[PDB]
């Protein structure tokens, strides 16, 4: 029933970053652009002149109008601001301004900004602002879906993860004559170590509606592959610190290895800080988990939705197996960290599931099964005489955030120094 409204669809395909739209606009990649080795649609731009991508627009789609509606969408991952040199330093990242008219995306401390300017210097801005004084952020250093829409008779709107954040009137702007090119480059950034990650840039020749935006968000989320906390693909054989979303100020520890010990949650996490710049919960706490292949026949190390795996727990630089004896009384089966040669017939197979909904991105569930494939239940926790022990429980399966987890690898955009 439809029309392709995407007039620029920038994707990595067949070994190159290209425009997939009918216009096939030309792409000039600079010499210091980094691509993620696992997902080549993920592009890293540094604070360097050669870290840039320029799109040469076909003339038919250069914006020069008093009336035409248009939108843009992309994903971005912005490292934590670390130093006061980033306060009050708006810097352009996606530039389609020519002679002070056009559009641009810029960033500032805790901000993503869209600016429109007409040929008579009338401007409007729409702004997403996120805090760095917050225990756990949905936004700092995590993949964010941005969508900006513009209706020349009323409002410009910015959406984040499919949700409307800010809307401002633009009907007083006259002719907007944008650039013949789009420059993806950090422009005016005083922090020499600043960078961004970006992916899936699109332009559209209409004002996208809410349904269209949510569909783009769901589609581009790649729900077939599980994600880590930052929004990158979850991997096998990669150590992760654990976050339980129900109890986000607690971390995972072990009270003795073996079948008479147990895994548990304890807190508080403690804080990471730079005065006036950030104050957040420490993320590099507790015993690391490593996801191990069991049933998957894919020969990459990406964790897919519904993969059956084992979970190893790292204690003193040695791996143990997360397991339980499902015969123990009561619905909740307490998890222990076992010597791998000693697991025997104990329950240890975990079904990994992505959980995509309207809350924080990148949630994962872990359904423990016995050796006949019967569900023992989702991994969460249960308070036993004031100790929050990790359990597998079919109580979750009949119905929450107690059984929702995120996997946090060390990342330079977070900047925390592990204690050990």
Author numbering: 872 to 1270, 1277 to 1297
Article sentences:
The same is true for H1253 with one exception: mutant HCA H1253K displayed a 1.5-fold increase in binding. Unexpectedly, the H1253K mutant displayed an altered oligosaccharide selectivity where the affinity was reduced for GD1a and maintained for GT1b, while binding to GM1a and GD1b was improved considerably over wild-type. This single point mutation seems to favour recognition of gangliosides lacking the terminal Neu5Ac and the interaction with the Gal4, thereby changing the carbohydrate preference. Binding of GD1a to HCA H1253K could not be detected, suggesting a loss of affinity for GD1a compared to the wild-type with a KD clearly above 1 mM. It should also be noted that the structure of a H1253K:GD1a complex could not be obtained despite crystallisation experiments carried out in similar conditions confirming the decreased EC50 of HCA H1253K for GD1a. The high-resolution crystal structures of the HCA mutants in complex with the polysaccharides of GD1a for Y1117V and Y1117V/H1253K, as well as GM1a for H1253K were determined. Single mutation of H1253 to lysine affected the ganglioside selectivity of BoNT/A by presenting a significantly higher affinity for the non-sialylated Gal4 epitope of GM1a and GD1b compared to the wild-type and Y1117V mutants. Additionally, the crystal structure of the H1253K:GM1a complex shows that the long K1253 side chain can reach the centre of the carbohydrate portion of the ganglioside via hydrogen bonds with the central GalNAc3 moiety. These results suggest that successful variation in ligand selectivity may be achieved by targeting this sub-site of the pocket, by engineering additional favourable electrostatic interactions with the GalNAc3 moiety. In the case of the single H1253K mutant, Y1117 seems to impair GD1a’s Neu5Ac5 access to the binding pocket.
Botulinum neurotoxins are the causative agents of botulism, a lethal paralytic disease, but are also one of the most commonly used therapeutics for the treatment of numerous neuromuscular conditions. These toxins recognise motor nerve terminals with high specificity and affinity by using a dual binding mechanism involving gangliosides and protein receptors. The ganglioside-binding site is a pocket built around the strictly conserved SxWY motif on the carboxy-terminal end of BoNT/A14. Three HCA mutants, Y1117V, H1253K, and Y1117V/H1253K were characterised using ganglioside-binding assays and X-ray crystallography.
